[PDB]
Amino acid sequence: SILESKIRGVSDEANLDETGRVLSVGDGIARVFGLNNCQAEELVEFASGVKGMALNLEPGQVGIVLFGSDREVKEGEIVKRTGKIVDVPIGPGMLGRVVDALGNPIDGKGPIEATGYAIAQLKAPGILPRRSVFEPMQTGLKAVDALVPIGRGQRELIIGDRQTGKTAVALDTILNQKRWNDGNDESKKLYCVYVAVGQKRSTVAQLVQTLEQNDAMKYSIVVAATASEAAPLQYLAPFTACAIAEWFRDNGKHALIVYDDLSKQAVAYRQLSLLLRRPPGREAYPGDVFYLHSRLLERAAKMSDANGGGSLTALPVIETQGGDVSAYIPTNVISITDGQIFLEAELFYKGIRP
Amino acid sequence: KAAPTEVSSILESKIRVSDEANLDETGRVLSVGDGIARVFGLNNCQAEELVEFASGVKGMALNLEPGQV
């Protein structure tokens, strides 16, 4: 009979509704056999403690991308589902601590005083909830405020080669807002949001130490996302940093996000998609390469008077190779932003900084 | 969606008695093309070992997977 054969063998419990068994894992990817009630882009928790994000849902397995190291995950491990999507912390208590890609504090200041829970993949603002860019974003540089002046709500790109003035332009604009943030006028203050993605460990520690000595790290969010972590952590650095800065624009304050850099975010998204058994596109990249950078930059727009009156400035730096701006990732970001700041390497070596 | 090795020809030999000849050193050529030869067998054959066909052509077993070489 069928009931007599299952009593002497079969299996045990382990329901595949809210849990699952990892059949294969490696190079960040983890094929979990099960998870029927798990939604798309949901936070998964393994038995070893490493977090996961199920991005590829098949009919027999479920491809989940690990957010950490895959050295503790083996075949047959239990992968539980949290029930929610990929969210991050937000609120006014995040100013003053170097957070990571999931909202955890990496500066050693204990827990983060979060006032809400916002998702990483959020929708951008519509045409009815947006107004014209009329405010003025004082960057501090004399050559940028008179020529290509940026405002609260616009997206200004920063294309250029290495060691030319890409990261120096975004750091000078955040320190120049100390004259308006130290007072009491909330309409003139602009909170900074540095999202260091793809940088090294020594580059993130040197930039945070210079802002704290000049009274500028008290109202600036630091998103630590080095290249020594997984591919899912560096690719989700742009969506997690935009959710924390969107809380101030929806209440009545101004924000300023700095996605440094835009070239490092494109290489991290193509690494996780190639390991999940997917077809590539151009230059060994995914098919939705232009849709990933255009969706994260469209949310940083100036709101109208009925939405609170806030705005969000986006400063995406584009790392070029020898001044070539006619590339695949260079031409895609220049046709989505409202202007760009070209940083040539010829005038930077002669002394004309920037 | 399927797999190689045992397929049609190689799947009808294990149901009866696949003995007689020594399959550890010899083997049956299942496919040949593009300068390769998928021999079915060679269990005790080491990696990068010299081989010989029935017509006198030499061979070198590069990859040694399960069921094929």
């Binding site: 998870l35 029927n36 009630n37 798990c38 939604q39 798309a40 882009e41 991005l55 590829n56 849902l57 098949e58 009919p59 999507i85 993949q121 929708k123 951008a124 603002p125 519509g126 045409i127 009815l128 947006r130 107004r131 014209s132 860019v133 709500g153 616009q154 999940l276 997917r278 077809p279 590539p280 596109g281 151009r282 230059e283 995914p286 098919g287 939705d288 390469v289 232009f290 849709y291 255009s294 969706r295 469209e298 949310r299 727009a301 701006v325 006619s326 590339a327 031409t331 220049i334 046709s335 989505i336 409202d338 760009q340 | -």
Partner: protein, 355 residues
């Protein structure tokens, strides 16, 4: 009712495979509804059929939140959009819903976005010139009335400023109604275009409007960007065939329609073409450009804008659209840096009315 209910079996990106019953499976280019957690819905267009009572569908929105085994009901027809005089002055989406916070579109009929083009016997040739107001357009390549116009140019040359300046001096004094359908634009360009038309008399919230607004920039996924050209052209085709009016379709940009289909072509089971494009580049571009022509019922002056990839006219998305346009206004990046406003090429621009 006999609703075709399906079950979600696969979900990777914008493509979502729905498994239905045997015989009750939907056809191609069919809208599939899906109940979410909010008050809206998840529209999904069926692209192809993988077999075994399953068809691969392309979602027109965010695919986050879908689990394996959810209910997927079929509408029975394609993506219906609101047509008529009720769509003028309102901001419509790719699925035919309002995004202007002005209530629902009170339309008596709803036509589908997927339709066949005109035949060879229904084509009506013409040779009338259309005055735009520029000195370099009225002397070099003149625009033809009722034909397709293409404003080719690179990034930062003057593609968005050319379509906005011509609509404030030709579309505001024309007898017919306009149809500004933006596909693959920006978030700030959609809010600035709607506010400029209200202060000039093109879109009246309390009176009468003669300009159809169709939203759909690059802030959505790949399914809403590729279907934005078919939804905007369905409202302009009804005013020239059923009503008989000289409609003016303004597409910005025209290069975003070909790039949106190649983003989901790799996950649908198709091999890539040249420069990372899809194999059906000439078939998808010809089916949408032939329907926006001039027939015996009315004319349709399409003033689309093509975006060259990093200033390159030899690409597969720029050279394939040059054979389906009468007047081509190609722009150069070298003339824009010298002070020419705008950078109009006097030798690269050609037209059929220059005889």
């Amino acid at each position: 009712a006999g609703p075709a209910s399906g079950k979600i079996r696969a979900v990777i990106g914008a493509v979502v495979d729905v498994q239905f019953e045997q015989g009750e499976l939907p056809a191609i280019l069919n809208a599939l509804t899906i109940d979410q957690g909010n008050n809206q819905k998840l529209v999904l267009e069926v692209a192809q059929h993988l077999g075994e009572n399953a068809v691969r569908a392309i979602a027109m929105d965010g695919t986050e939140g879908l689990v394996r085994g959810q209910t997927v009901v079929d509408t029975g027809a394609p993506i219906s959009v609101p047509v008529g005089r009720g769509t003028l002055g309102r901001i419509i989406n790719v699925v035919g819903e309002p995004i202007d916070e002005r209530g629902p579109i009170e339309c008596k009929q709803r036509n589908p976005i997927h339709a066949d083009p005109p035949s060879f016997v229904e084509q009506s040739t013409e040779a009338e010139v259309l005055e735009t107001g520029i000195k370099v357009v009225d002397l070099l390549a003149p625009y033809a009335r009722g034909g397709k116009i293409g404003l080719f140019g690179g990034a930062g040359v003057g593609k968005t400023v050319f379509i906005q300046e011509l609509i404030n001096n030709i579309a505001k004094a024309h007898g017919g109604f306009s149809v500004f359908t933006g596909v693959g634009e920006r978030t700030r360009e959609g809010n600035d275009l709607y506010r400029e038309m209200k202060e000039t008399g093109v879109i009246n919230l309390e009176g009468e409007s003669k300009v159809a607004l169709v939203f759909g920039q690059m802030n959505e996924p790949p399914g809403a960007r590729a279907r934005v050209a078919l939804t905007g052209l369905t409202i302009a085709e009804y005013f020239r065939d059923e009503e008989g009016q000289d409609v003016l379709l303004f597409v910005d940009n025209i290069f975003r329609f070909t790039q949106a289909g190649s983003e989901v072509s790799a996950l649908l089971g198709r091999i890539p073409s040249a420069v990372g494009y899809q194999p059906t580049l000439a078939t998808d571009m010809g089916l949408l450009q032939e329907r926006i022509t001039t027939t015996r019922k009315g004319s349709v002056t399409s003033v689309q804008a093509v975006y060259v990839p990093a200033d390159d006219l030899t690409d597969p998305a720029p050279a394939t659209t040059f054979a389906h346009l009468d007047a081509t206004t190609v722009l150069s990046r070298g003339i824009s840096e010298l002070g020419i406003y705008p950078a109009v090429d006097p030798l690269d621009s050609k037209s059929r009315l220059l005889d």
